[PDB]
Design an enzyme around this catalytic site. Structure first.
Site, PDB file in Angstrom:
ATOM      1  N   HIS A 112      -3.197   9.887  28.130  1.00 47.76           N
ATOM      2  CA  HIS A 112      -3.220  10.454  26.812  1.00 47.76           C
ATOM      3  C   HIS A 112      -4.306  10.483  25.969  1.00 47.76           C
ATOM      4  O   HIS A 112      -4.305  11.445  24.537  1.00 47.76           O
ATOM      5  CB  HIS A 112      -3.921   8.196  26.478  1.00 47.76           C
ATOM      6  CG  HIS A 112      -4.459   8.008  25.182  1.00 47.76           C
ATOM      7  ND1 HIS A 112      -3.487   7.362  24.038  1.00 47.76           N
ATOM      8  CD2 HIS A 112      -5.148   8.251  24.102  1.00 47.76           C
ATOM      9  CE1 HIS A 112      -3.947   7.480  23.248  1.00 47.76           C
ATOM     10  NE2 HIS A 112      -4.962   7.891  22.532  1.00 47.76           N
ATOM     11  N   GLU A 113      -5.551  10.830  26.539  1.00 48.21           N
ATOM     12  CA  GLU A 113      -6.377  12.099  25.881  1.00 48.21           C
ATOM     13  C   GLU A 113      -6.512  13.608  25.786  1.00 48.21           C
ATOM     14  O   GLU A 113      -6.056  14.390  24.639  1.00 48.21           O
ATOM     15  CB  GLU A 113      -7.848  11.757  26.627  1.00 48.21           C
ATOM     16  CG  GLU A 113      -8.445  10.531  26.429  1.00 48.21           C
ATOM     17  CD  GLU A 113      -8.541  10.268  25.119  1.00 48.21           C
ATOM     18  OE1 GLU A 113      -8.889  10.225  24.112  1.00 48.21           O
ATOM     19  OE2 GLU A 113      -8.263   8.322  25.915  1.00 48.21           O
ATOM     20  N   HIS A 116      -4.550  14.007  22.462  1.00 51.02           N
ATOM     21  CA  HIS A 116      -5.248  13.729  21.284  1.00 51.02           C
ATOM     22  C   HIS A 116      -5.681  15.942  21.464  1.00 51.02           C
ATOM     23  O   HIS A 116      -5.820  16.148  20.133  1.00 51.02           O
ATOM     24  CB  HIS A 116      -6.667  13.126  20.667  1.00 51.02           C
ATOM     25  CG  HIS A 116      -6.454  11.924  20.461  1.00 51.02           C
ATOM     26  ND1 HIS A 116      -5.086  11.709  19.706  1.00 51.02           N
ATOM     27  CD2 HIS A 116      -6.194  11.492  21.922  1.00 51.02           C
ATOM     28  CE1 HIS A 116      -5.694   9.950  19.739  1.00 51.02           C
ATOM     29  NE2 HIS A 116      -6.284   9.726  21.114  1.00 51.02           N
ATOM     30  N   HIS A 122      -3.097   8.950  16.950  1.00 53.13           N
ATOM     31  CA  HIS A 122      -1.817   6.895  17.777  1.00 53.13           C
ATOM     32  C   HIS A 122      -0.399   7.233  17.355  1.00 53.13           C
ATOM     33  O   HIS A 122      -0.290   7.459  15.789  1.00 53.13           O
ATOM     34  CB  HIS A 122      -2.833   6.731  17.640  1.00 53.13           C
ATOM     35  CG  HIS A 122      -4.290   6.335  17.986  1.00 53.13           C
ATOM     36  ND1 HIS A 122      -5.206   6.207  17.781  1.00 53.13           N
ATOM     37  CD2 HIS A 122      -3.916   7.155  19.486  1.00 53.13           C
ATOM     38  CE1 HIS A 122      -6.146   6.399  18.606  1.00 53.13           C
ATOM     39  NE2 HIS A 122      -5.375   6.906  19.754  1.00 53.13           N
TER      40      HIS A 122
HETATM   41  C1  LIG Z   1      -9.291  -1.296  27.206  1.00 51.22           C
HETATM   42  N1  LIG Z   1      -9.467  -0.508  26.209  1.00 51.22           N
HETATM   43  C2  LIG Z   1      -8.239  -0.332  25.073  1.00 51.22           C
HETATM   44  O1  LIG Z   1      -7.251  -0.664  25.758  1.00 51.22           O
HETATM   45  C3  LIG Z   1      -8.711   0.588  24.049  1.00 51.22           C
HETATM   46  C4  LIG Z   1      -8.927  -0.009  22.511  1.00 51.22           C
HETATM   47  C5  LIG Z   1      -9.148  -2.085  23.398  1.00 51.22           C
HETATM   48  C6  LIG Z   1     -10.449  -2.023  22.447  1.00 51.22           C
HETATM   49  C7  LIG Z   1     -11.092  -3.018  22.629  1.00 51.22           C
HETATM   50  C8  LIG Z   1     -10.450  -4.009  22.982  1.00 51.22           C
HETATM   51  C9  LIG Z   1      -9.050  -4.053  23.194  1.00 51.22           C
HETATM   52  C10 LIG Z   1      -8.139  -2.853  23.299  1.00 51.22           C
HETATM   53  N2  LIG Z   1      -8.475   1.815  23.689  1.00 51.22           N
HETATM   54  C11 LIG Z   1      -8.665   2.874  24.124  1.00 51.22           C
HETATM   55  O2  LIG Z   1      -9.841   2.908  24.894  1.00 51.22           O
HETATM   56  C12 LIG Z   1      -8.478   4.359  24.062  1.00 51.22           C
HETATM   57  C13 LIG Z   1      -8.674   4.823  23.207  1.00 51.22           C
HETATM   58  C14 LIG Z   1      -8.712   5.883  22.360  1.00 51.22           C
HETATM   59  O3  LIG Z   1      -8.059   5.845  21.336  1.00 51.22           O
HETATM   60  N3  LIG Z   1      -8.695   7.347  22.788  1.00 51.22           N
HETATM   61  O4  LIG Z   1      -8.169   8.317  22.706  1.00 51.22           O
HETATM   62  C15 LIG Z   1      -7.807   4.702  24.733  1.00 51.22           C
HETATM   63  C16 LIG Z   1      -6.854   4.534  25.716  1.00 51.22           C
HETATM   64  C17 LIG Z   1      -4.788   3.947  24.830  1.00 51.22           C
HETATM   65  C18 LIG Z   1      -6.282   4.869  26.925  1.00 51.22           C
HETATM   66 ZN   LIG Z   2      -6.481   7.434  21.242  1.00 48.87          ZN
END
Ligand SMILES: CNC(=O)[C@H](Cc1ccccc1)NC(=O)[C@@H](CC(=O)NO)CC(C)C
Ligand SMILES: [Zn+2]
Ligand SMILES: [Ca+2]
Ligand SMILES: [Zn+2]
Length: 157
Positions: A112-113, A116, A122
């Site tokens: 996923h990173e 980007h 997204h």
């Molecule tokens: C477990 N954490 C997540 O799933 C959080 C969203 C979140 C935050 C708070 C609570 C619930 C969900 N997403 C990320 O860390 C993303 C940040 C991002 O987009 N980097 O490019 C990366 C993942 C999709 C791999």
């Molecule tokens: Zn992301």
């Protein structure tokens, strides 16, 4: 935003102690392979020097304008293509990084990173690698939305 060149380099600056070094390298090299299998992009790992994509494991305020937040929350972030820090990927060292189904699978996050780092934003498709919250199905593969998005920027292999 996109890279003008189709042959890019990357460098793993440091490593998380949660996994053996070979597992980190593998997880990263396979994440790049996912994207290079559907586009004309090629990636070369360099061991020294400045690379197009610099990957590092860091925690809390690490000299960019996006401090990490400890365990859970945001797991990693990356910058769109450009000069300087553009393309770089940072993984929060405060997380537990794994090679299996236990949270959080490094290869799955790296996939996923790097989307980007190549210019993707997204997705709203829950099965897509680019969805904004982590998901792990057991086998990390690009969804149609992922393929459609990267080929819209670099063409198809
Ligand atoms: C477990 N954490 C997540 O799933 C959080 C969203 C979140 C935050 C708070 C609570 C619930 C969900 N997403 C990320 O860390 C993303 C940040 C991002 O987009 N980097 O490019 C990366 C993942 C999709 C791999
Ligand atoms: Zn992301
Ligand atoms: Ca975090
Ligand atoms: Zn950062």
């Amino acid at each position: 935003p996109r890279w003008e060149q189709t042959h890019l380099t990357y460098r793993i600056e440091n490593y998380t102690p949660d996994l053996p070094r070979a597992d980190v390298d593998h997880a990263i090299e396979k994440a790049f392979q996912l994207w290079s299998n559907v586009t004309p992009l090629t990636f070369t790992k360099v061991s020294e020097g400045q690379a197009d994509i610099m990957i590092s494991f860091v925690r809390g305020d690490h000299r960019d304008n996006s401090p990490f937040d400890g365990p859970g929350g945001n797991l990693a972030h990356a910058f769109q293509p450009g000069p300087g820090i553009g393309g770089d990927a940072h993984f929060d060292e405060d997380e537990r990084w794994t090679n299996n189904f236990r949270e959080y699978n490094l290869h799955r996050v790296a996939a996923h990173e790097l989307g980007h780092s190549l210019g993707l934003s997204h997705s709203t498709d829950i099965g897509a690698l680019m969805y904004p919250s982590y998901t792990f199905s057991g086998d990390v593969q690009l969804a149609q939305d992922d393929i459609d998005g990267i080929q819209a920027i670099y063409g198809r292999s």
